Design a protein around this ligand. Structure first.
Ligand SMILES: Clc1ccc(-n2ccnc2)cc1
Length: 408
């Protein structure tokens, strides 16, 4: 009966492991330098495509942190990358000096819904100008797949291969793979770990992208829940003073100026560096390495809808579904947007996983069925649900969405 009660408070703030809509890439095309494919070599080549660096300064301090240490840490990254450029053979990995600023940074309340998380979600459903996965990316079948399964997979893949949520998947798979590997290969080192992704342009050109860096702390991970701390340093064109509540956990630096094409001609815009301390565990990195399953889970939700239509119509409805041939339209606007919306929710469930999300998802689905039953044919459950509406942006956004469902 009642709409869910969302908490009052200061706006919720960003809590993802890496930047989403605000990320910025320095990229190299068709890379062919010596040692191409080694993360550190790619990172340096990406860094050297940019000529607008300048003396960095704090433009949005971290209110609870030691801001001079975040500044020192970024200047240390740049200095140590220069040292690598001066060694004859670029090494495969780079362990940072255990400076005072890095030792500090590596560790050696009700919130209301803010509009930024819905905007993040809209951004994640969008198409980009690049493809982020191969044609046979989805699935892990041992045997060749049937004709109908293949047809459905190829339809779906064409709709999500360029999706921004798919960039987040591959970004997430790469950085969790590299951090989990470093956590056992270099347990005592403050290893510098580039944040990289790869894509293919519309013209078919292979591109390598640098988002920033993380520096990992000491990582003797004896069990799945042991934490390795890290410091993330991420490029962005987003000025943090426009939405400061989003950036509560970050110290934000201004590190350069970038020349850009736009709807005017060339414009110069400042480049920022978003810095925060963070942590993760073996179990979370293993999930991060599995983010490609978001593609399979969302494909299966689509296949479920096709199999429903195919049972009512005693025929395979794959083509009629994906070509939008009984329904006379698509509420989201197009079949492609249905696919990408399903994918973005799966991805955000992974990016923003939490016990609040798990609690809200089960208990709200119970209230859901009850309210349809009362709708079609005509307490303390509310406490279970609203116990999960504390401060998590994604859970709060889903609660807001649920209330749109109650109104309609
Ligand atoms: Cl690879 C690389 C590029 C630029 C810099 N840098 C030095 C000062 N400002 C940027 C350091 C390393």
């Amino acid at each position: 009966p009642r709409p869910l009660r969302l908490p009052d408070g200061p706006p919720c703030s960003q809590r993802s492991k890496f930047l989403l809509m605000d990320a910025l890439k320095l990229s190299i095309e068709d890379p062919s330098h010596e040692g191409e494919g080694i993360p550190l070599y790619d990172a340096i080549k990406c860094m050297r495509t940019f000529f607008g660096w300048k003396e960095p300064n704090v433009v949005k301090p971290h209110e609870k942190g030691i801001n001079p240490n975040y500044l020192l840490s970024w200047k240390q990254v740049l200095a140590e990358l220069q040292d690598i450029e001066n060694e004859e053979k670029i090494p495969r990995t780079k362990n940072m000096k255990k400076t005072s600023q890095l030792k500090w940074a590596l560790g050696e309340e009700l919130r209301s819904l803010a509009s930024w998380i819905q905007n993040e979600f809209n951004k994640a459903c969008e198409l980009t100008d690049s493809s982020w996965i191969e044609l046979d990316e989805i699935g892990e079948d041992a045997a060749p797949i049937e004709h109908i399964a293949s047809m459905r997979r190829n339809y779906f893949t064409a709709e999500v291969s360029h999706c921004r949520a798919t960039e987040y998947i591959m970004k997430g798979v790469y950085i969790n793979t590299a951090l989990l590997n470093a956590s056992c290969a270099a347990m005592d080192d403050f290893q510098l770990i580039p944040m990289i992704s790869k894509c293919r342009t519309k013209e078919g050109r292979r591109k390598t992208n640098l988002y920033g860096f993380i520096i990992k702390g000491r990582s003797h991970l004896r069990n799945d829940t042991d934490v390795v701390n890290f410091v993330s340093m991420e490029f962005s064109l987003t000025d943090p003073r426009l939405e400061p509540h989003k950036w509560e956990k970050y110290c934000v630096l201004e590190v350069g100026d970038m020349l850009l094409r736009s709807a005017i001609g060339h414009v110069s815009r400042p480049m920022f560096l978003y810095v925060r301390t963070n942590g993760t565990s073996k179990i979370k990195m293993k999930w991060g390495m599995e983010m490609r399953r978001c593609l399979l889970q969302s494909l299966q939700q689509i296949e479920s809808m096709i199999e429903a239509e195919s049972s009512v119509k005693e025929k395979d409805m794959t083509k009629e579904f994906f070509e939008n041939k009984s329904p006379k339209g698509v509420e989201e606007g197009s079949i492609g947007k249905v696919c990408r919306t399903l994918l973005a929710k799966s991805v955000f469930n992974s990016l923003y996983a939490s016990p609040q999300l798990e609690g809200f998802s089960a208990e709200s689905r119970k209230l859901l069925l009850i309210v349809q039953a009362l709708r079609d044919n005509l307490g303390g459950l509310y406490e279970a649900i609203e116990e999960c509406l504390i401060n998590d942006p994604w859970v709060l956004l889903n609660a807001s969405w649920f209330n749109s469902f109650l109104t309609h």
